[PDB]
Design a protein around this ligand. Structure first.
Ligand code: PHU
Ligand code: PHU
Ligand code: CL
Length: 174
């Protein structure tokens, strides 16, 4: 058994106008994180991790994340394939992920060189998850960007305790 805040309908999730795929490349730090399966846990606060986007020849992205867990660096790789409009993607090689029947990415807003907000929705074991990531090119962002992110997450039905600001670290992500 499992209870989840429902995914918003896509009409409520804006799309970055005139998305520039090659400017979105490079390292982004995960400055904010929110979702129906994200919980604020004060006993054990989430550590910052990073995500690198690289354009392949075919204009899919190789997307690599690194996190510091159990005293080591863990890498995971995914392929984002361009969707129906610029700034939208689906997950490549979906059959290689057991349980996963759907996966969508939509870039909500970015200025490419400081901040981005990205929306993810997926269906895993027939359950529907969503998250919003607040990316920064650096590890800190203005109170304004963070409050903007809180507001947007709440507009999608997420209460405060489903919204976390991972703690900046030095291991693995520099
Ligand atoms: N900063 C930056 O790269 N901006 C940009 C580039 C091309 C088109 C639209 C916006
Ligand atoms: N917790 C969590 O990771 N949720 C999630 C992940 C990927 C896509 C959509 C939602
Ligand atoms: Cl990410």
């Amino acid at each position: 058994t499992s209870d989840l805040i429902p995914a918003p309908p896509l009409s409520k999730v804006p799309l970055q106008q005139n998305f520039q795929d090659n400017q979105f490349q490079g390292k982004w730090y995960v400055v904010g994180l929110a979702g129906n399966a994200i919980l604020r846990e004060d006993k054990d606060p989430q550590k910052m991790y990073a995500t690198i986007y690289e354009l392949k020849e075919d204009k899919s992205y190789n997307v690599t994340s690194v996190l510091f867990r159990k005293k080591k660096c863990d890498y995971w790789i995914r392929t984002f394939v361009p969707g129906s409009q610029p700034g939208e993607f689906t997950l490549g090689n979906i059959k290689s992920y057991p349980g996963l029947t759907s996966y969508l990415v939509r870039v909500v807003s970015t200025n490419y060189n400081q901040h981005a907000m990205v929306f993810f929705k997926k269906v895993s074991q027939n359950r529907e998850y969503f998250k919003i990531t607040l990316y920064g090119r650096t590890k800190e962002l203005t109170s304004e960007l963070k409050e903007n992110f809180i507001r947007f997450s709440k507009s999608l039905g997420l209460p405060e305790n489903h919204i976390v600001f991972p703690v900046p670290i030095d291991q693995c992500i520099d």
